[PDB]
Amino acid sequence: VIQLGRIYLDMLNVYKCLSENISAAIQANGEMVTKQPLIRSMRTVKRETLKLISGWVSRSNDPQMVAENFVPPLLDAVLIDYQRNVPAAREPEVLSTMAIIVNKLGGHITAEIPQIFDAVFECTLNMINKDFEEYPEHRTNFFLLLQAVNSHCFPAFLAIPPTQFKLVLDSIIWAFKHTMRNVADTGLQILFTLLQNVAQEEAAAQSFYQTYFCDILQHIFSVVTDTSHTAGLTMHASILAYMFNLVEEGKISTSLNPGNPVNNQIFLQEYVANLLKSAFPHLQDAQVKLFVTGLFSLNQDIPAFKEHLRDFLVQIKEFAG
Amino acid sequence: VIQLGRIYLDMLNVYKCLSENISAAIQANGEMVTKQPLIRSMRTVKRETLKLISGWVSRSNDPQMVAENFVPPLLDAVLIDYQRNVPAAREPEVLSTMAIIVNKLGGHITAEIPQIFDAVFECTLNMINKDFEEYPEHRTNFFLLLQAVNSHCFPAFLAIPPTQFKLVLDSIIWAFKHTMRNVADTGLQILFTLLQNVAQEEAAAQSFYQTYFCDILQHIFSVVTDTSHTAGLTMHASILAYMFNLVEEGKISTSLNPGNPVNNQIFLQEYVANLLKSAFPHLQDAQVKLFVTGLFSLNQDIPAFKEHLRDFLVQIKEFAG
Numbered sequence: 109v110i111q112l113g114r115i116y117l118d119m120l121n122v123y124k125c126l127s128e129n130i131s132a133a134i135q136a137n138g139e140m141v142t143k144q145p146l147i148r149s150m151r152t153v154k155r156e157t158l159k160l161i162s163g164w165v166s167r168s169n170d171p172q173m174v175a176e177n178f179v180p181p182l183l184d185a186v187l188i189d190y191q192r193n194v195p196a197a198r199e200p201e202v203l204s205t206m207a208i209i210v211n212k213l214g215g216h217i218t219a220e221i222p223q224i225f226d227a228v229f230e231c232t233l234n235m236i237n238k239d240f241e242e243y244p245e246h247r248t249n250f251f252l253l254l255q256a257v258n259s260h261c262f263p264a265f266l267a268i269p270p271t272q273f274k275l276v277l278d279s280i281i282w283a284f285k286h287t288m289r290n291v292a293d294t295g296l297q298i299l300f301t302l303l304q305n306v307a308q309e310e311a312a313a314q315s316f317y318q319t320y321f322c323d324i325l326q327h328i329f330s331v332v333t334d335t336s337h338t339a340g341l342t343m344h345a346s347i348l349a350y351m352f353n354l355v356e357e358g359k360i361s362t363s364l365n366p367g368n369p370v371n372n373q374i375f376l377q378e379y380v381a382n383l384l385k386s387a388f389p390h391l392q393d394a395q396v397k398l399f400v401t402g403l404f405s406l407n408q409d410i411p412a413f414k415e416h417l418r419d420f421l422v423q424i425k426e427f428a429g
Numbered sequence: 430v431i432q433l434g435r436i437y438l439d440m441l442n443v444y445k446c447l448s449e450n451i452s453a454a455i456q457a458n459g460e461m462v463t464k465q466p467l468i469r470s471m472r473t474v475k476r477e478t479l480k481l482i483s484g485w486v487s488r489s490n491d492p493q494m495v496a497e498n499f500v501p502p503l504l505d506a507v508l509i510d511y512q513r514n515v516p517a518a519r520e521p522e523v524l525s526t527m528a529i530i531v532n533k534l535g536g537h538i539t540a541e542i543p544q545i546f547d548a549v550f551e552c553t554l555n556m557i558n559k560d561f562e563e564y565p566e567h568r569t570n571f572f573l574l575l576q577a578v579n580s581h582c583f584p585a586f587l588a589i590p591p592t593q594f595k596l597v598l599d600s601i602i603w604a605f606k607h608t609m610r611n612v613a614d615t616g617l618q619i620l621f622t623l624l625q626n627v628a629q630e631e632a633a634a635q636s637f638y639q640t641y642f643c644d645i646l647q648h649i650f651s652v653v654t655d656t657s658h659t660a661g662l663t664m665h666a667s668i669l670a671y672m673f674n675l676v677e678e679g680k681i682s683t684s685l686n687p688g689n690p691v692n693n694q695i696f697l698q699e700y701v702a703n704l705l706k707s708a709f710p711h712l713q714d715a716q717v718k719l720f721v722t723g724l725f726s727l728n729q730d731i732p733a734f735k736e737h738l739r740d741f742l743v744q745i746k747e748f749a750g
Contacts, residue, residue: 152473160470
């Protein structure tokens with residue numbers, strides 16, 4: 109019932125003008141500025157403005173209309189302002205607002221994603237991939253946004269520069285490798301969905317597998333291999349089972365190992381075997397082979413697959429402590 | 430360096446549209462609404478808007494220009510919206526904003542005080558005078574505004590209707606009779622300043638004395654008289670000293686007691702004497718009479734006057750415990 113229609117442009121105008129007031133105060137007096145009562149008020153109005161615009165958009169019922177008339181002026185007021193400002197001055201509500209228009213408009217704004225990523229993707233990433241849990245709110249909204257593009261504007265991932273997509277996977281990997289069991293599971297959730305969306309893009313699926321399949325596999329295993337971290341074992345099994353099943357069912361037509369083009373099954377078996385032999389040279393060769401065989405054997409029974417993994421971590425922990 | 434000129438119009442426009450959004454949500458679904466995230470965001474934007482405007486006005490440098498060009502639209506957007514709303518939806522920053530413009534513009538907006546008081550005085554007063562410490566922020570801002578007007582737009586107190594001017598005094602009395610030292614001293618400080626302001630209004634001065642002098646005197650004593658309440662004794666002494674000095678110097682030309690027109694000195698002596706006798710029938714007439722004479726004797730030595738009062742409390746206290 110929130111109606112912002114008649115003051116919508118007025119709100120964006122106030123937003124842009126307050127942004128400049130904030131920048132100017134920073135370009136002249138540093139970040140300490142951000143603590144002054146009035147600069148805080150200006151930040152608040154920018155923040156609450158996005159929340160209101162977000163709630164207004166999340167309950168509209170004419171996606172094309174919103175996409176053509178409201179989104180353009182919104183991106184004009186928030187994108188470049190977020191990109192060119194010091195981290196201490198970027199409103200995290202800008203990321204959450206993008207996520208909200210994506211979940212609401214999907215395909216109607218897919219063409220807009222590149223423009224949005226160029227403005228908030230890499231700079232936001234550099235703010236959160238720093239171990240130190242600084243900018244926890246941006247980290248949250250970052251993944252809400254990524255989860256949204258992945259869900260309703262998937263094509264955009266192929267649209268952006270391959271080098272940028274590489275960073276997309278890097279943040280996902282970084283996320284499911286995080287100690288905060290909450291972040292890690294959003295990463296695994298994103299990774300699972302992404303792999304499924306990739307399978308729908310038969311045109312580009314092979315390039316993806318060829319480029320990222322083994323990498324992703326290696327990283328997932330590095331996490332399950334890590335002592336004391338049964339956290340998310342369910343999703344690891346879920347993802348691994350899915351990936352192994354793709355190979356067994358011959359969904360990956362390209363030869364993952366272009367070097368020595370053999371069966372992906374044969375290559376994958378050796379590949380995973382080596383990963384494990386390396387991480388644990390103490391492991392008996394024939395037992396590693398049996399463990400890997402079971403990964404394909406149980407690739408369609410997640411609960412069984414999970415237990416299979418669990419048992420193997422005991423055939424390692426016990427051999428240590 | 431807050432440059433609102435560019436967006437002032439827009440800000441007031443958003444303020445007005447959000448108010449309507451809030452009113453509609455309330456006047457349709459009860460007060461409970463005010464707790465919803467979006468209604469809160471609206472309220473916050475309205476609040477920060479006033480803070481930004483207040484801060485901008487406080488650093489302006491052309492009082493006349495501001496009063497003729499910025500105050501009118503501001504009052505159009507905030508006054509009636511404040512008055513006709515439910516207490517739970519009246520922004521206390523409206524009161525503080527009014528105080529700031531009064532303290533900055535003074536006589537340039539004296540003509541607007543009547544309009545401001547009609548919109549925020551009584552409704553606010555009724556919100557705070559309820560013993561229960563509710564709306565503690567409105568209360569604080571209420572007196573900040575009252576002080577502003579008293580200090581810079583005194584004449585207005587003569588312009589508003591006498592019945593309203595009587596509510597002004599009632600609230601000042603109510604405040605210095607409060608349990609909170611903080612509130613009480615604000616009341617005493619306002620009272621002292623208003624008494625002085627009245628002295629400069631020769632024409633209206635006599636009318637004031639004739640109507641309020643004895644009442645004020647009685648209320649002050651009722652507080653000084655109260656057991657366990659040494660709080661603000663210095664101010665009580667300062668005010669009483671001032672009042673008795675006015676009478677001794679014949680500044681009150683009109684006859685306080687129109688009934689039995691005698692010397693204000695003679696009448697005032699009996700007046701305070703009886704006040705004390707009624708409240709404390711256990712006091713000796715001659716002892717009371719001496720205490721009163723001492724009030725004129727020391728009316729120009731506040732420290733001595735204060736000690737005079739302190740000693741009299743003991744010539745009452747110990748007679749109990």
